[PDB]
RNA sequence: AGUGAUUGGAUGAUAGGAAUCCAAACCCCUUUCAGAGUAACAAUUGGAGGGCAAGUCUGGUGCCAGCAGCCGCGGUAAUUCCAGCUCCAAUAGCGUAUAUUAAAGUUGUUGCAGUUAAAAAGCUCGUAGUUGGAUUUCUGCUGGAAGGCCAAUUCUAGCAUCCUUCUGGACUUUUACUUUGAGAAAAUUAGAGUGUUUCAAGCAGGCUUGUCGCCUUGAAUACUCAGCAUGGAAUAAUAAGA
RNA sequence: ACUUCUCCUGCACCUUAUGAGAAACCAAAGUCUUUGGGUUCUGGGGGGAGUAUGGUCGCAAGGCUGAAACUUAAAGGAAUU
């Protein structure tokens, strides 16, 4: 949301749910943000991670986990 | 409604009430000069009896 | 007045002054449970500007039980600071002033940010509902439409106030259904404004950054009591 | 029968009684020294001609030959009338006008702005009592509205006591009486 | 008319089945009386 | 639902002109019975002579005797009862005195406290307000 | 910054001239002798329970008289009647009655509703009427004229096997559709220009000791289903099937 | 004949919805102010009235079509105490 020349007007940007790509509003208290930690060789290790967020619209279906598998198959660390 | 309601009492309270004259007072301003007074006395309920 | 003892993770963080402003809370979508959190951000003079509260309506409610009737008063209160922040709250109580206290507390707790747009050309601070946004509550459809600048607000007097407390300068209201019930009408108007951020434009097609939460970054403070 | 056009300069609002409306109108009477609520609704109506003209034009397209003609004619009026300042000539700016912009441009204020009148009310009385030369000839009417080249020009009429003429009638009665 | 509601009986009423019959007897009578004056 | 298709002008146009008559206010305008009905001739005001002075009682809850007048319109000689506004003024009417009749402001129907749709605006052309005021 | 009749000195309403106007009077515009201090040259019209802005005031009346568009006031303490005082709204205007438009997404093409609120024919056939599946020269490269802006967007010729009878029109089934164009009275309506003192208006004006006065003066322009004409590759009818 | 498993086609049933509704409830009453797949019929506050008159079908009983004057501020729906 720009105007005239630069200056991103408005306050903040709503997070976009990974599973549906649909924006999470202010008062969705059923929203989630997972952190999943990486590992080095013979790890061990955390602190570097893949963040991922999903809305309460997706969760109350029961389709949270099936989509969250897809979002960490493409990263590498599952093999479904 | 019934037609035979009597017309004797018509003009009871207009005739009953005690007459009294209006007091002589100094005239209010009119037009623009009235809207001057109404502007000032608000910004420096409106009718508050004892 | 007064030094409240913060309860919960959010309460502790705000008093210390770690979280900067409420857009950080609204991003990660965290429930503000005490009103003392939101009292902190809108400080007098400092707030620019302080939150303003107006009492929309007072309605006597009666329950017929046994001998006699018991009447309680339900107080609708909207509250907002012009510049995108608005809220809407209700409470009932046996006396009138005791309802309005708790109604203002509930109004602050249900405080929601409102994005705002330009109607065609886009110069010099936004002034409108950014698209045609509907809201419903209990057989009261309300539809807010962008208007050109200087249009002002077109709607019911009740409509003018709680769009006024958002900061929306221009509108075209429609209103189907029984607008006589002001309890439903305010909720219908309010839940329209709540959905403004929820609606996805081509301006927000870019994939998100994912910053750390205020719960994450100030975890080590929240270890100790 | 007679071929003479005529129109209404103003129209009353839909709600008679609103405390939001009546307060904000009463300020405009108090600032600029007006007779009645018709004088506000006149300017309310006069803006909405200009505003609805721009609202029609602005929807189209900047390269459209209707907008480039009719827009530039409308912007010339706002520059001439001293209503929009010349630094911004965008049609968009016309929308951001208010009633206070029009009511600062009328001759009640521009006397007072000039400062000869002293007080808003006095300035209306000076206008109606045949003082104040605007340009070449004197002007009797509060709701004149000045065209910005003319504004420097307002001065007391050559005739009259402020101007340098016969001192009305009451000063003569004192002077010849003594 | 009345159509479907016809017999809603939302509040204390005569009862539709009886009402229809009462009007039929009034109507039937109207016929013979109007044919008598021919 | 409706027929949407481009060539469905007849069905759309016919349905309005038929089902416009389902309105109550449309029938009061557009039927021929408006001209026979009313004692007025589709008119604002009408003169008449006061055949009799009459009194009627308001339906409960309100109770009282309202003081109205029976009048015959000059054009049709149709009797009507016209209410007399304000305190007294009954004395003012005088049987056989011409009185202007005006609508009660409810488009017939009825007013408040039974079956009266008219008000006497003037008596002998004097008018009610002037006398009650005494101005 | 507002009050306080405490005094205080500083323009036309009016009445009569002058010239101007007028066919002859008259009005306007000019300038004139008189011409306001409770500025007696005195602003009224509807309201003050809610809707609707504005009095839990003070007397009289006691479901009476009356108010009241609707809800409702009055049965002896009336926030509504009849008065007084104060305040509110509009203001040289304001109230009432009838018809009409918006509000009326309460006639709904845009745009309503039909389980229970008003309303799905008891059920099938069925002629008009309305509506009807997919599919038939798509892609590519090289120009040309323009083109906005610090190459995009238009339009157009070729070459992948592309007519010709001539020197612009004939053929491409036929229309609808869309585009541009013709022709269609003004007044009114929107609208360009212009200080009728402003303004509703009007179509005038504006420069200037120059005299065949000048601005080769202005009074633009839009708008006005069916019908006539035309560029076009989709969509939809329709035709057919050497 | 029975067991296990898949396919369409029936009458339904249970569970649940960031789908809908005034609510009761609803795999349709969903995909409708983010309003247009095609089409038939019906309704416009409550009475007066499915009455009056005229028409037409019927052997009759009655059916189909179907008004007005006047009347009235509420009738009506779903849940709560």
Coordinates of C-alpha atoms in Angstrom, one line a residue, chain F:
Chain F
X1 CA -36.8 -17.4 -9.9
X2 CA -37.0 -14.8 -12.7
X3 CA -36.3 -15.4 -16.4
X4 CA -32.9 -13.7 -17.0
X5 CA -32.6 -14.3 -20.8
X6 CA -32.2 -11.4 -23.3
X7 CA -35.6 -11.9 -25.0
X8 CA -37.8 -12.0 -21.8
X9 CA -39.2 -8.4 -21.9
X10 CA -42.8 -9.5 -22.1
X11 CA -42.7 -11.7 -19.0
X12 CA -40.9 -9.1 -16.9
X13 CA -43.1 -6.2 -18.2
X14 CA -46.4 -8.1 -17.8
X15 CA -45.6 -9.3 -14.2
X16 CA -45.2 -5.7 -12.9
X17 CA -48.4 -4.3 -14.4
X18 CA -50.3 -7.3 -13.0
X19 CA -48.7 -7.3 -9.5
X20 CA -48.6 -3.5 -9.0
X21 CA -52.3 -3.9 -8.1
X22 CA -51.3 -6.0 -5.0
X23 CA -50.1 -2.7 -3.4
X24 CA -52.8 -1.0 -1.3
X25 CA -51.5 2.6 -2.1
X26 CA -51.4 1.9 -5.9
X27 CA -55.1 0.9 -6.0
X28 CA -56.2 4.0 -4.1
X29 CA -54.4 6.1 -6.8
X30 CA -55.1 4.2 -10.0
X31 CA -58.7 2.7 -9.7
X32 CA -61.7 4.6 -11.0
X33 CA -63.4 4.4 -7.5
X34 CA -61.4 7.4 -6.2
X35 CA -63.8 9.8 -8.1
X36 CA -67.0 8.3 -6.8
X37 CA -65.6 7.7 -3.3
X38 CA -64.7 10.7 -1.1
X39 CA -67.2 13.5 -0.5
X40 CA -64.4 15.7 -2.0
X41 CA -63.8 15.7 -5.7
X42 CA -60.1 14.8 -5.5
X43 CA -59.8 18.3 -3.9
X44 CA -57.8 19.9 -1.1
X45 CA -60.7 22.0 0.5
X46 CA -64.5 22.3 0.1
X47 CA -67.2 24.6 1.4
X48 CA -70.5 23.5 2.9
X49 CA -73.4 24.4 5.1
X50 CA -73.7 23.2 8.7
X51 CA -76.9 21.2 8.8
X52 CA -76.4 20.2 12.5
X53 CA -74.1 20.7 15.5
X54 CA -72.9 17.4 16.8
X55 CA -71.0 15.7 19.6
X56 CA -69.2 12.4 19.5
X57 CA -67.2 10.4 22.1
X58 CA -63.6 9.2 21.7
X59 CA -62.9 5.5 21.9
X60 CA -61.2 4.2 25.1
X61 CA -58.9 4.6 26.6
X62 CA -59.6 8.3 26.0
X63 CA -63.0 9.6 27.1
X64 CA -64.7 12.8 26.3
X65 CA -67.1 14.5 23.9
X66 CA -65.2 15.9 20.9
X67 CA -67.6 18.5 19.3
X68 CA -67.9 18.0 15.6
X69 CA -70.2 19.4 12.9
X70 CA -72.3 17.7 10.2
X71 CA -72.0 19.5 6.8
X72 CA -73.3 19.3 3.3
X73 CA -70.9 20.0 0.5
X74 CA -72.2 22.6 -1.9
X75 CA -71.2 20.7 -5.0
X76 CA -72.6 17.3 -4.1
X77 CA -74.7 18.0 -1.0
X78 CA -73.0 15.1 0.7
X79 CA -73.1 14.9 4.4
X80 CA -69.9 14.7 6.4
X81 CA -68.8 15.2 10.0
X82 CA -66.1 17.8 10.5
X83 CA -64.2 18.1 13.7
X84 CA -63.7 21.6 15.2
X85 CA -60.1 22.2 16.3
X86 CA -59.2 23.8 19.7
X87 CA -61.0 24.7 22.8
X88 CA -64.7 25.7 22.3
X89 CA -65.4 27.4 19.0
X90 CA -68.6 25.4 18.9
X91 CA -70.4 28.6 19.7
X92 CA -68.8 30.2 16.7
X93 CA -70.3 27.8 14.1
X94 CA -74.0 28.8 14.0
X95 CA -76.3 26.3 12.2
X96 CA -76.6 27.1 8.5
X97 CA -73.2 28.9 8.5
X98 CA -70.8 28.1 5.7
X99 CA -67.7 26.3 6.9
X100 CA -64.5 25.4 5.0
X101 CA -63.5 21.8 5.3
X102 CA -60.0 20.5 5.1
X103 CA -58.5 17.0 5.3
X104 CA -57.5 15.8 8.8
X105 CA -54.1 15.2 7.3
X106 CA -54.3 11.4 7.3
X107 CA -55.6 11.0 3.7
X108 CA -59.0 10.0 5.0
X109 CA -58.5 6.9 7.2
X110 CA -59.0 8.2 10.7
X111 CA -57.3 10.5 13.2
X112 CA -56.9 9.8 16.9
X113 CA -59.4 9.5 19.6
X114 CA -64.1 7.8 15.8
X115 CA -64.7 7.7 12.0
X116 CA -64.0 11.4 11.3
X117 CA -61.8 12.4 8.4
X118 CA -62.3 16.2 8.2
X119 CA -61.5 19.4 10.0
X120 CA -63.3 22.8 9.7
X121 CA -60.6 25.4 8.7
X122 CA -62.8 28.5 8.5
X123 CA -66.2 29.7 9.8
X124 CA -67.8 32.4 7.7
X125 CA -64.3 32.9 6.3
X126 CA -63.0 34.2 9.6
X127 CA -60.9 31.0 10.3
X128 CA -60.5 29.2 13.6
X129 CA -57.0 30.5 14.6
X130 CA -57.9 34.2 14.4
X131 CA -60.8 33.8 16.8
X132 CA -59.3 31.5 19.3
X133 CA -56.3 33.8 19.4
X134 CA -58.7 36.7 19.3
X135 CA -56.3 38.5 17.0

